[PDB]
Each structure stands twice: as structure tokens, then as C-alpha cells.
Design a protein around this nucleic acid. Structure first.
Lengths: 186, 121, 72, 187
RNA sequence: AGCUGCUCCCUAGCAUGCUACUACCG
RNA sequence: GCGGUAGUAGCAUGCUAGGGAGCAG
């Protein structure tokens, strides 16, 4: 605090007393310089304190409003930021097994059930089109999730069994394309 | 004693003499740092006091023979510091003038924690 | 390193929860069981097996536009 | 803090002070006009500070009586609610057979556990696993607690209906499998 | 959606205490 | 020039109340 109006008066009284006690003048003259400077301190703090209180109110208001804002901000975006953080952690984690199925799913290789781990146990995946099959279904062994699966029961969207050998690019434009493959691990 | 209320005990020279102090189980502290209930800690730039208290609980690890322990303490310290720093930076842009008097610097000086273990209060 | 996959499991399970997956007791039970076992798992590889076994579940439905998030 | 008999005394004393100070006359003038900021303001200290506390205390009295009023309001509301709950609870039970078994008591007091056991009008059973179901409410009616119960309406954990047909031995691994069976008191 | 116990932080209020300077009487 | 009664602002203590958070069983 400095540029305050009452500080002008306090400064005047202080400088006047400085000059008076420098000249070393009478005692009857400082009777003012005391009854005129004490008041300066009086008429002065009763305003530096008052603005000071407001100066703390400003803080304890801003410091509240800020967090109040960013609070409801963060409780607006969970089911969004959460997913992207998840996939960020995925990409950083780096496991070919995962990336395989993740790309496959960007493509369409959605499994209709949980991937099992038992040497037996069945698996049901979906295939949209031919090349997907060709990029995946090779003979009767199936390479999925970087694992080897035995192809046993192909069926198209008409829910009818279709001959594995029939599957080839030539006659493929005749099939209920959402193909549902079933298999077992090695 | 080997363990009591899930605290271990360690005999440390506090200045002139030797005193028994309870230090917790670090894994517990770390876990409390890493997993919470939504808004809590997530954007902890509004929750410093959590870490203040936590560090309080993890002070005695400073006096420990094994290494990584005290590293936990220093970790919490530096994290508090970075927290407050990037907080003030945001608050400045939000308005245009930083706060007048924070007095939060004491929180990242070790001595204040040490006071919580000395017989005079 | 293993901490990474563990935290990843936690986040993923939270996501599944957000997708209201607990409206089918069998599915939610299998998921929770897997997640627990992960958090107690002490090898490097069995973790990944259970991890992908779980993630498949998210892959099931079509609530999470995968390609969009795959914007790198 | 404006319209007071002290304010007017202040104003007139200050007016005379300004007059005889611009006159700059006697030392008695200075005395009688300092006896103004010194004597005409003691009243203006009291009544312009005391009256400031009267308002404060009256208003805090008002707010506390407000809080007490709202409090006793909540009391009436909750007691009405619980009275309603009681009165609606009983309005589902007064079958004569209850009265009957009451009259059979040598005293009129009976252990609680046996009231619903004998007198309920509907039973619910929770079943975990298939073999267990087989060993109880298998078939469309069964017996329990010396009475005859008939099955109707069976749901699952997800609270979806399921028929008795599906409850095979090998179809069971296809259901939310701790079923709820609600049966009725058959005569 | 509990019973306690300890600890930190923030805020208000009251009262005290104290300080001093400003006003009345001695 | 001292003593007693009225102000101010400041300081200290404490007590209450209110609110946030963490640990132990």
C-alpha cells in the first residue's frame, strides 16, 4: 500500500515532523506534530485495513470460483476422456496379441463371445467379406489373437451351413456375408 | 514390535537422543496416491491437502536404512511443488492477476513435517 | 512394467461399467472375476492372456466407435 | 442511522461551531465549540452504536426463529409420513386365520418367526444351482412347511421371466443363475 | 448408507486478553 | 503532568460453530 489518498496526508505529517525535529524547534510546536501525526496514522490505518479486507475477499472468492468451475468441468467428460486415455494406455502398452485383434476390429472381426483359453472351448467370430477371410481363414487352422484355432462350423447370415471349400473370391458374391465362424484353440 | 495397527517401528536418532517412530507400509501410500473416486485426485491441482496429509503419514520413511523408501517422501514433495506451480499458472490465465498471499510454500519444505514428531505441543 | 497392464485393466473395467454392462449378471460376474485375478497375477504373460480375454468383452458391443478413437 | 434526536443536536452544534469559528472570536468560543465534538457526540456514540446492535440482535432472533419453525415443520412432515406407513402396512394382513391362531394362544402372545411361516399368502424361494432346484420346487407344485404351494411366474437375476421348460440339466448354463421362484398358497 | 479415535486445512462468531493512539471526568 | 470513564485500529489467547480431507480398528 502506498498510492492511497490518506497516505498523502500521513506523508505530509511525517515530513513536517521530520523537518521540525531536524530544526530542533520548540516543544509547543510538536504538540501539533503529535496531535497531527497520530491522527494521520489513525485516519490512515482505518483505510489501509479496510481495503486490505476486501483484498482478502477477492482471493477467497477467486480461489473458490476457479475450482468450482473446473469441478463440474471434469464431471462432464468422463465417458469420453476415459476411453481415449484407455486407448492411449493400450497403444503405449504394446502387445502384438492385442494390436492384432484391435486392428481386426477396426476392420470388423468382432467376436460374439469371450475369447477362451482352454485348449478345448469354442470361439465365435464374425467376418464381413472375402479378403478378411483370406487374410485370416487359411485351410482349417484359424489365426486369431495371434493364436491357432481349428475351423469347424462356418455359417452365413441366412443361418445355413456353407461349405468351406465353396468360399473363394469367384463365387463369394453370393453369400450372406456376415459370416459366423466357430473354432477351437490348439 | 514387528507390527501394530499396520505400522512398523524404527528407532531413529532425533537430534541428541533416540526415539521410536512409526512408519507405514509404502505400497499402501503409493496406492492411495494412484487410485481414487473420480473427481478426487483426478485433477488434484485442487486437492493438495490430500497429499499434504499423505506426506505427513510418510515422513519417517526419510530416516530409513533402505533406499527407495525416502525416495517416496521426496517424490511426494516434488509432486506437491509441481502441483502448486501448474495451478498458479492456470489461475493467472483464468483471470489476470495471481493471488496476493498463498503462504503455501511452507508445505514443500521438510521441516514443517518434522514438527509433527517432537514432544512439545 | 506390470503396473502398466494392471492400471490398464482398472481403467478398462471402469469403462465397461460406464457402458452399463452390469445389466447382465453373468457377463458382469465374469468380468469382475477376470479383473480381480489380473490384479493378483504375478507373472508377466498370464496377465496379457486374461487382459485380452477381458478386452474382447468391450469389443463385443458397438457403443465405442473404435475407428474414431484410433485416430492416433 | 440518520433520523435521530442526536443527529439534530450534532447538526446544530456544528452549525454554531462553523459560525463562531469563521468568526474566529473568543477562547470561550473555542471552549464552547469543542464542548460539541466532546459533549454532543457521547449521545451520538451511544445511540448511533447501541441502535446498531439492536438491529443485529433482532435479526439474528428472526433467523433463529425461522430455523426453529422449519425444524418443527420437518417434524410434522416426517411423523405424518411414518403414521401413513404404519396405517398402510397393516392394511394387507387381517385375514381371519391370523386372529384364529391368536385365539389359540393361552395368553395372546406368540413367537414372531411362526407368524409368516403359517399365515403368509405367498412364498419366495431363492435357488442357486440346478441340482438344488431339482431337489425342491421341481414340478409345478410342491410342499413346504406342512402346506401345499403351487408355482407360478419365475424370474431370474436380471429379473426377466423364464418358463419351466428351459430349466433342463444342460440348458442351465444359459441363465442368470440364482433364480427367484414365487409360489402361492394352494388349498 | 456404521461405530469411534487421532490429524491437517479453511471459514465464521463470541468473549477474553493485550496493545496503542482518538474522545470525557479527575 | 498523572489517575478513572468513552473510541479506534492492531495483536495475542482461547472457545464455539461451520466446512474440506486423510490414517488407524
Amino acid at each position: 500500500f502506498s498510492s492511497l489518498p490518506s497516505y498523502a496526508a500521513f506523508a505530509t505529517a511525517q515530513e513536517a515532523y521530520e523537518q521540525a525535529v531536524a530544526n530542533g524547534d520548540s516543544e509547543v510546536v510538536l504538540k501539533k506534530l503529535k496531535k497531527s501525526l497520530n491522527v494521520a496514522k489513525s485516519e490512515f490505518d482505518r483505510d489501509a485495513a479496510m481495503q486490505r479486507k476486501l483484498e482478502k475477499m477477492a482471493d477467497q472468492a477467486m480461489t473458490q470460483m476457479y475450482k468450482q468451475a473446473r469441478s463440474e468441468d471434469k464431471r462432464a467428460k468422463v465417458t469420453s476422456a476415459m476411453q481415449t486415455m484407455l486407448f492411449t494406455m493400450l497403444r503405449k502398452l504394446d502387445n502384438d496379441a492385442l494390436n492384432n485383434i484391435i486392428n481386426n476390429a477396426r476392420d470388423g472381426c468382432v467376436p460374439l463371445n469371450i475369447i477362451p483359453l482352454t485348449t478345448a472351448a469354442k470361439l465365435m467370430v464374425v467376418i464381413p467379406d472375402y479378403n478378411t477371410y483370406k487374410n485370416t481363414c487359411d485351410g482349417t487352422t484359424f489365426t486369431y489373437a495371434s493364436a491357432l484355432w481349428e475351423i469347424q462350423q462356418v455359417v452365413d447370415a441366412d443361418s445355413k451351413i456353407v461349405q468351406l471349400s465353396e468360399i473363394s473370391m469367384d463365387n463369394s458374391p453370393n453369400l450372406a456375408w456376415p459370416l459366423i465362424v466357430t473354432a477351437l484353440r490348439a | 514390535p514387528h507390527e501394530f495397527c499396520s505400522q512398523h517401528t524404527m528407532l531413529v536418532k532425533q537430534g541428541d537422543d533416540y526415539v521410536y517412530l512409526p512408519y507405514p507400509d509404502p505400497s499402501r501410500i503409493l496406492g492411495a496416491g494412484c487410485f481414487v473416486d473420480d473427481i478426487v485426485k483426478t485433477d488434484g491441482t485442487l486437492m493438495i491437502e490430500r497429499f499434504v496429509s499423505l506426506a505427513i503419514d510418510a515422513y519417517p520413511l526419510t530416516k530409513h536404512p533402505n533406499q527407495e523408501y525416502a525416495d517416496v517422501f521426496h517424490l511426494y514433495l516434488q509432486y506437491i511443488r509441481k502441483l502448486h506451480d501448474e495451478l498458479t499458472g492456470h489461475m493467472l490465465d483464468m483471470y489476470s492477476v495471481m493471488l496476493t498471499n498463498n503462504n503455501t510454500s511452507r508445505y514443500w519444505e521438510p521441516e514443517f513435517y518434522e514438527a509433527m514428531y517432537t514432544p512439545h505441543t | 512394467k506390470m503396473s502398466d497392464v494392471k492400471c490398464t485393466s482398472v481403467v478398462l473395467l471402469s469403462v465397461l461399467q460406464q457402458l452399463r454392462v452390469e445389466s447382465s449378471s453373468k457377463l458382469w460376474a465374469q468380468c469382475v472375476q477376470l479383473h480381480n485375478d489380473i490384479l493378483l497375477a504375478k507373472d508377466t504373460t498370464e496377465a496379457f492372456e486374461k487382459m485380452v480375454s477381458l478386452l474382447s468383452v468391450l469389443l463385443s458391443m458397438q457403443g465405442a466407435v473404435d475407428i474414431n478413437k484410433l485416430c492416433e
